Design a protein around this nucleic acid. Structure first.
Lengths: 213, 156, 82, 175, 135, 58
RNA sequence: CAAGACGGACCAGAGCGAAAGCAUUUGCCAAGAAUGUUUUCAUUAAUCAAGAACGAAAGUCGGAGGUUCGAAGACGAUCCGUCGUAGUUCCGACCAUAAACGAUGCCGACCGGCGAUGCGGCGGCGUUAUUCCCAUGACCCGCCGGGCAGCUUCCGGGAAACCAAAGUCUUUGGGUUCCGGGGGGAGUAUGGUUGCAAAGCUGAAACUUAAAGGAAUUGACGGAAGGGCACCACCAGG
């Protein structure tokens, strides 16, 4: 009988300092009527933001999940929550006459954020190849997968969230894997296609401050 | 098909719920086999004539109770009554009715009660545990219903 | 076509055929003599050897068994024999 | 500025090369849009400029090239630009019955018919365009014509012969 | 009423266009997706079960959602298309396309088009039998 | 040299499609199919790619 | 957050298995074909009556679990829809049947061409591993072996469709197993036997009939569909 949207208000949701474009948009919360506070409804919200709106020159097929968990007077503060590829890109990458190799590791970083890493890779037809298909054998596939797992283990476990995210922005890990697997079977499109967030540590406010500034 | 299922004797492959129920509540006679050239348009299967008359007075059997018990037992007719009563839906309906009976007569239900164990040991106590539903006559179902009603298990 | 001497096949055809299907069967393997790089001794090794071959004095691996022909250690010298 | 990206598969690049003229000339002349083909990311890229009117043409323009990505002929997608209510509906053959192995290929043959004629016949019945993928079927037309074509196809793969569905669809098209 | 945003800069929402095989849902929400702004089906728009999934009903629904968002001052939308998904058909129908071109006709800025439909890895047995097709 | 190389790669792909169709047809042993196919045999600078090609800018 | 189910796209012209069947990673376990071999034994082999192992799905007997689907059933329409019982899932016993197909025993020999594919092996320049510092992987060329599958062919064969076997067959003999003898009666009756059951294996006669069946080429045929022309046809009109 009365509109709740007048009763609502607007907050500003903003990216961490690792990202060039920091203002990522607006959010609509209700004011506190004494029953429930705006923070409790605001301290857990997940945003699906593409990377092309976070960097001017970066790619568009990469999407980052950012969880907002604090308010600072109409200024939402966010943090890394996940990574994924656009489904158009994933559907386009799976061509026919080749082999798909997937690897996943449950790796603990230096400050307790338990991550899960999923990567995918495809064998590449050579420039002089006359055979229509390029199928990797099973032991070659197992070797490629093993090198994938050890590269992510040696690459994520030794760093913190800022370095991991700054490596995931241009996908340097996938380029490392593509360069390292060349002597097993030449790979074509190696991306860390999905990052999850299984376990977060106890809540701290300072680490969010150097993530923001 | 319907006329032969109507007059079916136990042991016949055409024995069904209709056969046992109509042999309970009434007396039936298959009279004369009718050709379909007598009809227009002539039907799919052949035609037949059935003479039926109800038993007056009827036998003192609750027909809802009888039909419910027979409906449970003919879920799978070649399957034994033990496995017919292991069904979870059967356990649900008999739990409802046994709860009604305990509510009416103020019977205290033990915590470790198993309705299926009760049904199994009564069915072995009757001797119908290894018998199958396709080979039971009216009298066996009468004995089974008498035992189940004497044990407070009702089908309604 | 339909006109050739089966009794006298040429060396290229009889070489090309399977080792059992020749005019008279003959093996494709051979015995070859190997000098270890760390010594001077001669070891007679089968070309398709299934055992790892150690030097009798130096105990250095001369060849490693593979699916077909044996894989000599780099540094070893070998000569076809007989 | 408004951005549209349309992906291209690996098999559609050569027909895109052989039909690029009749793709950009309808857009650049009377739709007033800028188009390019990003070879590095393999996407048909459409964006607006200073000389665009009736912004929904952009949407239709995207659907335009989308039809040529899905396998449709060029002039049908030209008709998609000219007409106002034209839609495309797609479904896999196994989305209506679980078929495996040789049964699936027989279903493909029943949709296509000998010489293609059965599929062609359905087109001339429903004034639609039907493109068969390996297993996917795409129908372009208006809503009721899409429904009639979809019913005809679903009967064709149900096991009904092409002659019976042929006669039924040629009789029911008089409503 | 509305966001305190300068005229040059726009404000973003995301619109789920759920094209079920019986109607179409137009659910506008913010970037987080938790709280809503506008969602109208074919149900409030046409009083006939014939045209519940028609492109016309979804079109009129999209115009109503667009004018609602303009009254709220939402100047742009991201599009998250969706079909039934799961065991059933995976492609959005004509209703989603009709709603999309309708809200494009209303002058609303369209952001990122994206097909977000429930594709299984593999799933359970489908609704039809071993025999049953659509018709 | 390289043109013949591309021709050979195309030939390999076309032979793949042809041999797939050949095996699919060879599975079919129905006499009506063979009769119908016998009757049938007896019866018989670019704007775009580079950069933004449009009216306003090129 | 949880429960049960299932491993798409990659996924085929693929591969493996005695067949039924077999698609998430990782580890363990025990098998296996082909290849390579100047190892060993030295006829140890081929084929099956008897007897035994395995045998999709549905089904029966005990448990566990029951997400989806779903015989029956209850309702609403008039081949469909809502709900959903037994089941579908796992473990342990049975049952042993399918268009369980190549509607096509197994072992052996001989008898055209081609260029593709999977595994192993051999020979060979070259390009790649940000010119890789030798080998190794990925490609490239050719050959050999056992495969899966094609195209071609006056080898011959077949009633023909067609077959590199369905050939080497009246010019009729490599070895061996199962099995048919016009159509029905009839997989019925009867007996035996297996099974908890459902059913499985074996299996007639009286009588009755002049056919039963396989393959291919075909004129006419009320019609049917695509077009075109015409104010002696139409739209708008006078």
């Amino acid at each position: 009988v009365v509109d709740p949207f007048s009763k609502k208000d607007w907050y500003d949701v903003k990216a961490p300092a690792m990202f060039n474009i920091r203002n990522i948009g607006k959010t609509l919360v209700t004011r506190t009527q004494g029953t429930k506070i705006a923070s409790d409804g605001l301290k857990g919200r997940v945003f699906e933001v593409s990377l092309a709106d976070l960097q001017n020159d970066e790619v568009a097929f990469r999407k980052f999940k950012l969880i907002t968990e604090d308010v600072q007077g109409k200024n939402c503060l966010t943090n890394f929550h996940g990574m994924d590829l656009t489904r158009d890109k994933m559907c386009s990458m799976v061509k026919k006459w080749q082999t798909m190799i997937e690897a996943h590791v449950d790796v603990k970083t230096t400050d307790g954020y338990l991550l899960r890493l999923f990567c995918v890779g495809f064998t590449k037809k050579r420039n002089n190849q006359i055979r229509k298909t390029s199928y990797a054998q099973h032991q070659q596939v197992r070797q490629i997968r093993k090198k994938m797992m050890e590269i992510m283990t040696r690459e994520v476990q030794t760093n913190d969230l800022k370095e991991v995210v700054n490596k995931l922005i241009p996908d340097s890990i996938g380029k490392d894997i593509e360069k390292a697997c060349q002597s097993i079977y030449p790979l074509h499109d190696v991306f860390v296609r999905k990052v999850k967030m299984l376990k977060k540590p106890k809540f701290e406010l300072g680490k969010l401050m150097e993530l923001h500034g | 098909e319907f006329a032969l299922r109507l007059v079916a004797k136990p042991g016949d492959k055409l024995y069904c719920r209709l056969s046992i129920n109509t042999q309970l509540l009434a007396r039936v006679d298959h009279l004369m086999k009718v050709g379909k050239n007598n009809f227009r348009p002539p039907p799919k299967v052949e035609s037949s004539v059935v003479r039926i008359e109800p038993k007056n007075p009827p036998p003192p059997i609750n027909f809802q109770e009888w039909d419910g018990l027979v409906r449970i037992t003919f879920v799978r007719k070649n399957k034994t009554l033990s496995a017919a009563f292991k069904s979870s839906a059967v356990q649900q309906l008999l739990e409802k009715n046994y709860r009604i009976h305990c509510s009416v007569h103020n019977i205290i239900i033990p915590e470790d009660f198993s309705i299926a164990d009760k049904i199994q040991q009564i069915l072995t106590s009757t001797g119908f545990s290894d018998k199958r539903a396709r080979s039971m006559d009216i009298d066996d179902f009468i004995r089974l219903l008498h035992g189940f009603n004497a044990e407070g298990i009702h089908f309604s | 076509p339909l006109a050739k001497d089966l009794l006298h096949p040429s060396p290229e055809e009889e070489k090309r055929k399977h080792k059992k299907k020749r005019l008279v069967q003959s093996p494709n393997s051979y015995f070859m003599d190997v000098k270890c790089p760390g010594c001077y001794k001669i070891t007679t090794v089968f070309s398709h050897a299934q055992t790892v071959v150690l030097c009798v004095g130096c105990s250095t691996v001369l060849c490693q068994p593979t699916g077909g022909k044996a894989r000599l250690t780099e540094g070893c010298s070998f000569r076809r024999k007989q | 500025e408004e951005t549209r990206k349309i992906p291209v598969p690996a098999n559609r690049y050569t027909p895109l090369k052989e039909n690029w003229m009749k793709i950009f000339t309808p857009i650049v002349e009377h739709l007033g849009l800028q188009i390019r083909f990003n070879l590095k990311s393999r996407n048909v890229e459409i964006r607006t400029c200073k000389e665009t009117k009736d912004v929904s043409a952009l949407t239709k323009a995207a659907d335009f090239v989308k039809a040529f990505i899905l396998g449709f002929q060029v002039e049908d997608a030209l008709a998609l630009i000219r007409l106002d209510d034209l839609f495309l509906e797609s479904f896999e053959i196994t989305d209506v019955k679980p078929l495996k192995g040789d049964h699936l290929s027989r279903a493909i043959g029943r949709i296509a018919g000998k010489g293609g004629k059965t599929k062609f016949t359905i087109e001339n019945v429903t004034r639609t365009r039907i493109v068969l993928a390996d297993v996917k079927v795409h129908i372009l037309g208006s809503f009721q014509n899409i429904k009639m074509a979809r019913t005809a196809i679903c009967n064709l793969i149900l096991g009904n012969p092409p002659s019976k569905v042929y006669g039924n669809i040629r009789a029911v098209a008089s409503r | 009423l509305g966001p305190q945003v300068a005229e040059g800069e726009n404000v973003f929402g995301v619109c789920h266009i759920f094209a079920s095989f019986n109607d179409t849902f137009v659910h506008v929400t913010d970037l987080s997706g938790k709280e809503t702004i506008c969602r109208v089906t074919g149900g409030m728009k046409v009083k006939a079960d014939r045209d519940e999934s028609s492109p016309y009903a979804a079109m009129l629904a999209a115009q109503d959602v667009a004018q609602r968002c303009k009254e709220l001052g939402i100047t742009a939308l991201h599009i998250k298309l969706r079909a039934t998904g799961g065991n059933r058909t995976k492609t959005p129908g004509p209703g989603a396309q009709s709603a999309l071109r309708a809200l494009a006709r209303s002058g609303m800025k369209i952001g990122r088009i994206e097909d977000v439909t429930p594709i299984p890895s593999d799933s359970t047995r489908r609704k039809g039998g071993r025999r049953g097709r659509r018709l | 040299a390289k043109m013949r190389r591309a021709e050979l790669q195309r030939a390999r792909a076309l032979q793949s499609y042809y041999e797939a169709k050949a095996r699919r047809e060879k599975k079919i042993k129905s006499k009506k199919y063979h009769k119908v196919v016998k009757k049938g045999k007896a019866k018989k600078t670019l704007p775009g790619w580079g950069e933004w090609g449009g009216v306003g800018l090129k």
